[PDB]
Amino acid sequence: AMDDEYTKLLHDGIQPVAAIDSNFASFTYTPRSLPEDDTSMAILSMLQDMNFINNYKIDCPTLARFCLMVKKGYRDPPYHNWMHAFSVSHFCYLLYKNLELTNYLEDIEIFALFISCMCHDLDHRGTNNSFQVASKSVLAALYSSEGSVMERHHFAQAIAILNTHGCNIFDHFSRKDYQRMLDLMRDIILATDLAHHLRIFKDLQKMAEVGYDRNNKQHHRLLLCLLMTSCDLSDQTKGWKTTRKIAELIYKEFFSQGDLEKAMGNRPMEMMDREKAYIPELQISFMEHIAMPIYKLLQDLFPKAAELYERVASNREHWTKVSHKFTIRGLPSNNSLDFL
Amino acid sequence: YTKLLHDGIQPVAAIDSNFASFTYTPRSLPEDDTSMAILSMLQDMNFINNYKIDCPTLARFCLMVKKGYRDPPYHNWMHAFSVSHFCYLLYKNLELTNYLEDIEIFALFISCMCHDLDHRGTNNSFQVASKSVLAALYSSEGSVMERHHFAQAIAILNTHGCNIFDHFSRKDYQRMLDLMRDIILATDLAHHLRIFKDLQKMAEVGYDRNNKQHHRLLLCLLMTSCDLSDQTKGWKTTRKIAELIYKEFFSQGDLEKAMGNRPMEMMDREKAYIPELQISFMEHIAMPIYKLLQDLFPKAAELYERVASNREHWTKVSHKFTIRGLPSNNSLDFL
Amino acid sequence: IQPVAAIDSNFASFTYTPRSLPEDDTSMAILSMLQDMNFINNYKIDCPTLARFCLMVKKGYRDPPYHNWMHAFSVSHFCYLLYKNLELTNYLEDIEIFALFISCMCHDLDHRGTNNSFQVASKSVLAALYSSEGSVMERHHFAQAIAILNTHGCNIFDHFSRKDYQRMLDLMRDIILATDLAHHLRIFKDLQKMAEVGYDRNNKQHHRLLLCLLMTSCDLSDQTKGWKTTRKIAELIYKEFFSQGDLEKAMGNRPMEMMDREKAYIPELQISFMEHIAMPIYKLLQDLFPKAAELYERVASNREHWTKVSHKFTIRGLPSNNSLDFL
Amino acid sequence: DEYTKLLHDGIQPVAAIDSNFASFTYTPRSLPEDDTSMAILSMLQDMNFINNYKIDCPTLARFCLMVKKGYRDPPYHNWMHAFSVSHFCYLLYKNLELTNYLEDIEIFALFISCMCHDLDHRGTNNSFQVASKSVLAALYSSEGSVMERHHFAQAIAILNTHGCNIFDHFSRKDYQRMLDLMRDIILATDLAHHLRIFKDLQKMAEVGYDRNNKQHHRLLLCLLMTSCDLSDQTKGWKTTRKIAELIYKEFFSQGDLEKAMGNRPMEMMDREKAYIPELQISFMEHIAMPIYKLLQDLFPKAAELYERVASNREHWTKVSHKFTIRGLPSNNSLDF
C-alpha cells in the first residue's frame, strides 16, 4: 500500500500548490480540512513552492520515500498524530508565504524548520514527559537524565528515518551542511518542549525589546524556537470551530493518560483527571499564560502577524462566553435526575 | 472439483450485492456455494494473482479443507466459512493494509479456513478428562484442539495436489507456516485471556506499525474478532448460534456426567441458565474484544455497537425462560 | 516366553554385548527381560498384546547405520542390566522402571539418521509440526509410540487404572524427551546437585531427574562394553553424521565440522565426545550407584584405547599398494 | 540457519571448546569467530544463568546473534573485542569465585554488559562525537560518556526487540534493577569514569571488600568491568602487540578525519606525530598496571594478571628502540 502510494507520488508529478485549495496560503485556511490521503502530496507541493526541492537538489524518489516514512512514523492518538504534524508543517509554510522569513533567517534554517515541523512529534504515544518518568518507560530509561524525554525520542526517530536506506534526503549534502541540518533539527525539535519555551521566554522578550538583529546568531536561534512554538500551537489561531475540536482532541488524550495514571495508583494532575478538569478554565489559562504571549511576541517581531494574535485573543473570549453552558440549567435533555 | 473449474472464479458482486458489507450474513449462503465464495474472496483481495497461486491447487485445497470439518452443531465448515468471510470483511472495510503486511493478511484468511479442522464439538479440558489421543499428544504443551487443527492443516498442505504454497520462496513458505501456527494457536480462548492485558497495552500506547510484537498481537485480536463474528450480525444470528453452541456444550456435559465428572455449569443442561450465560459471555468476553478492535480501527465502531445491541436484545427476552401460566400444550407432565 | 538363562548365561552381566544377539531373536529377548523383571505378571500385561506391541515397535524403526532397531534393543537391554545389577526397585517405583524400559524400546522410533537441526534446516513436515516446541525428533518418536499403542491389539496398558495409564503416558513422554542431548546438557547441573546432596527416594523431583540420567546412560551404553563395540559404533555414527553433512552440502549449507567428511578428524572428535559427554554421565551414575563403577572404568579404558590408536589416522610409510596415487 | 544450529543443537559443554578455556592463559581471540556465539551459550550455561533466570533458549539464541550483529567492523571495537571481554568476565567468575562476592543478578548483569558494552562503535571516541556534533552528542548533551550512553541504548533496543528479551523472567522490580545495573556497568567503561573513581577503588582495596557494603558492590562492578575491557593486556606478548596494531589503526583513522574537518587531533591520534611505543608504555604504566594491581589487592588469585601486564610493559620497553630505524629498512632502500 505504501508501495502504490510511493509510485503515484513519484511518477504522477507534484500538484501545484494552488490546486489544493484557493485559500491554501492564507492564515484563514484550516489545513485539517484536507483529506489525510492528500497530505503527503501537499507536503511535496509546499516544498516545491518554497523552492527547496530545486535549491537543495533533493532526489525525488528519496523525498517521496521520506515523506511516506514520516507519515508512517506517527501513531493515532486523538491529537498527536500525522494530521497534527501536517497542520504544524502547513503553518510553517504560511509563515514563509506571509511573513518574509528570508529577511530574518538563512535558507537552510527555514528548510530545517519545515522538516522539523513534519518530524517534531514522531512516534508520540499520547502521553507526556511526566508520564514517561513516572511509568519508568523505555524512553525515560534512555533520556530522563537529559530531560525533554519525548522530544529527544522524536528527534531520534527523525534521524532513524534519515538513516533508513533510500530515505536520506540530505545525503548529498557536504559534511558541514549535513552537520548543520542535523544540529538545527536537534535544536528546533527540542524547542517544542513547552518547558524549554518557558525557560527562554525572557530571552525572547529581550530580543523583541531590543529589536531583531540578523547578524546575531543567538537571535537566529531564539527566533527559530519562537517560530516552531508558533507552529505547534497554531490550531489556536484559526476559527472557533477549530479550537473547539482541538480542545476535544487534546483533552481526550490527556484524560486517557489520567486514567492510566489512576490505574497505576498515582494521582494525576487536575488537567489530566476527567473527574476534576474544568475545560473552559484550563483552556482560558492556557491561552492567557502560554498562547497569547507567544503570538504577541510574534506580532512584535512581525507586524503582519497581528491577525494571529487577534484570533487567539478572540478565541479566548469565545471560551469565556460559552463557559456558562458547562453548567446544567433546568433538567438534562433526559428529563432525568438519574445521573445523580 | 468439476463445478468450480467449470464456472471459473465469480466476481464478488455476482454472489450478492451486499457480500462485502458488515450487515451481510454469510450463513445465508447455501453450503454448496461456499467453496466458490472462498475463491471469489481470495480473487477480490487479489491474493491469487499477487502470490501466483495455482488455481486448481487452490480449489483442491479449499475442498480438502471443507472436507476436513466434521458435523457437530456449531464447530463445522459453515463456522469456518463465516469466520473466513469476516476476515474478508475486515480487509474490505478496515484499512488493514495500513497496519499489516500482505502475507500477514493472507495467512490470517487461510488460518480462518483451517482454524477448527476436525473439531469434535468438545473443548480442551474434555480431551484431557477423556484421555483422548489428542490429549496424549498435546496436553503437556496446552491448547490441545488448536495444536490438532494446525497439524490437520499441515497434513492438508502436504497432501498431493493441495500445496498452495509449494512455489513460494523458502523465506515466504516459512513465513506462512509460522504465521498460521501462531494465528491458529491464538484461537484458544485461554490464550486470548492470557494476552488480553498486552492487547490493552497496545491499544493504550497506540499501534506501532514498526513493532513486530504489535503485528503479532493485532493478528491475534483479528483472529478472535473473526471467531466471534456471529455476534456482530442481527438478533436471528446470535439466537441461532446460541442454540448451536449450547447444543454442543450440553452434549459435552452429558458425556462428562457419564464419565462420573461434574461438568461446568454452562455445559450442564440441568443447571445452565442460557440468558445469563449468554449475557455474561457477550458483556465480558465479546464486547471487550470489539471495543479493542474499535480502539484500533474507528471504522469498527459499528461492530461493537451491534454486539451491544444484541446483548440488549438478550436482556429483553430473558423473561421468556420463566414459564408463566402453563406450557403451550396446557400440561404439567414436564414436572 | 523363554527364560533369560536360556538365552545366554552371561545375559544379565554388564560384560554382555546385546548386539551379539541375532536380530531375529530380539523380540523374544524383550519378552524374556520383561518376564524376568516380573512386569507381565505384576501389571497383568496381556501376552498376545505385548507380543503384537513388541513387533510393531521393532517394525517402526528404519534402517540407518546407527539409529535402527538394534540400537533400541541394545538400549533396552542396558535398562534391564541396570535393573538387575543396581537393584533399581530400591530407588524408583515399579511403574517408573516399567516406563523406562518401554521408553527405551520406543525412544528412536522412525529415526531418519539425521539430527534435529537438520529437520529444521530442511523444512521437513516434522520441523513444521515440532520446531516451535523443540526436540523435533523426540516429539516424533513419542508420537509414533502413541500411534502404536492406539493400533488395534497393541495397547499394553489398556487395562491399567486411569491413574496408572496417565502416569505411564506422562513418564513415556518425559523419558523420551530426555533423550534429546540438548535436554541432558540443560539439566546437567541439576543432576550434579542431586548427586552431591544424595538421592532422596521421597523426593519426586529426584525420581524425575534419575529417570533422565538412567535413560541417557542406556542411550550411550555402547561406550561401556569393550573395544570392538566402541570402534564399530564410531563407524556407524560417523557414517550417519557424514551422510547428513553430504545432504547439507547439497542444500547449499555448510555442515558442522563433525559432519563434514572432508574436515572431520575422527579420533579427536571421538575422544572429545568420550571425555566431555560420555564420561561425565557414567561418573554421575557411579556417584549415585557405587555398583556402576565398572561402567565408568570401561568408558575411561575405551577412551584410552582411542588415544592409543589415533596415530593410525596418519599415513606412515607407503599405502599397502606401494603407491602415492592418492595425492 | 546459524540460528537453527545454535538453537536446535545442544549447548556445547564448556570444557569441550578447549582444554585451557577456563584459564587466565587462554587467548579467546584464538577461537574462530564462527564459534563464538556457541561459546557465549556455553559460558552462560556453565555459570548457571540459563537455570537461575529461566531463560527461554530460542530467546537467548536470538539475543546472542542480535548482539553480534550490533557490532560494526572497525579494527578494534568489533564483536571479537566484545567476545574476549565477555570471556574474561567468565574467567573472573571461575577463577576468582565471584559468587562469594557479588549477588547472582550482579554477575549476570556484568556478563551481559560485557557482551553489549561497545555496541554500534564506529572506531571514534567521545571527543570525536562532541567536536563533530554527532547525533549521539546531540542526544546525550549534559554529561560525558556519549558513546557509553549509546552502547546502553543499543542494548535496550535489543532487549526490546520481539524475541530477544532474555530478562522476561524478572519481576518488574528486578527488571528495573537489571536495567540500572547495565547502565552503571556500561557507563563504567568510560575510562574517564574509572579515573574519577580511582581513589575510591584504592580506598576499598586498602580497607578490604565488604560484601555488606552497597558502595563496595558498585565499585567492585566497575573495577571488574574495566578489568574485562583491558584484558588483552593480560595475555602474552603476541596479544598486546596485535591489539596495539588494531587500536592505533583506529586512533589514526579518527585523526585523519579530524584533520580533514579542520580540527586538530590529539597527538596519539595523529599518525604524523604519535610514537606508539612511548604511548603504549605510558598506557601500561599509568592506566593498565594500576587496575590489575587493585584487582590483585582485592583478590590474591588475580596476581598472575598484574604480573603479565607488568611483563608485557617491560617487553614494550625492550622493543621500543625498533621504532627508530637503525641500519637499512627491510628492502635495502633509502627511497623513503
Ligand SMILES: CCC(C)(C)c1nn(CCO)c2c1N=C(c1ccc(-n3ccnc3C)cc1)CNC2=O
Ligand atoms: C503546548 C502544550 C501542548 C502541545 C500539550 C498543548 N497543545 N495544545 C494545542 C494548541 O492548539 C494545547 C496544549 N496544552 C494544553 C494545556 C497545557 C497546560 C495547562 N496547564 C498546566 C498547568 N496549568 C494549566 C492551565 C493547561 C492546558 C491544553 N490545551 C491546548 O490547547
Ligand SMILES: CCC(C)(C)c1nn(CCO)c2c1N=C(c1ccc(-n3ccnc3C)cc1)CNC2=O
Ligand atoms: C466455543 C468457544 C468460543 C470462544 C470460540 C465461543 N464461540 N462462541 C460463538 C460466538 O459467536 C461462543 C463461545 N464461547 C462461549 C463462552 C466462552 C467463555 C465463557 N466464560 C468463561 C468464563 N467466563 C465466561 C463468560 C462463556 C461462554 C459460549 N458462547 C458463545 O457464543
Ligand SMILES: CCC(C)(C)c1nn(CCO)c2c1N=C(c1ccc(-n3ccnc3C)cc1)CNC2=O
Ligand atoms: C547421536 C547423539 C547421541 C548423544 C545419542 C550420541 N550417541 N552416540 C552413540 C554412543 O554410543 C554418539 C552420540 N553423540 C555424539 C556427539 C554428541 C555431541 C558432540 N559434541 C557437540 C559439541 N561438542 C561435542 C563433544 C559430539 C559427539 C556422537 N558420537 C557418539 O558416539
Ligand SMILES: CCC(C)(C)c1nn(CCO)c2c1N=C(c1ccc(-n3ccnc3C)cc1)CNC2=O
Ligand atoms: C580503555 C581505553 C581504550 C579503549 C581507548 C584503549 N583500549 N586499549 C586496549 C586495551 O587492551 C588501549 C586503549 N588506549 C590506549 C591509550 C590510551 C592513553 C594513552 N596515553 C597517552 C598518554 N597518556 C596516556 C594514558 C595511550 C594509549 C591505546 N592502547 C591500548 O592498549
Ligand SMILES: [Mg+2]
Ligand atoms: Mg511534542
Ligand SMILES: [Mg+2]
Ligand atoms: Mg477453535
Ligand SMILES: [Mg+2]
Ligand atoms: Mg534419539
Ligand SMILES: [Mg+2]
Ligand atoms: Mg567502550
Ligand SMILES: [Zn+2]
Ligand atoms: Zn506538536
Ligand SMILES: [Zn+2]
Ligand atoms: Zn472457531
Ligand SMILES: [Zn+2]
Ligand atoms: Zn537412541
Ligand SMILES: [Zn+2]
Ligand atoms: Zn570495550
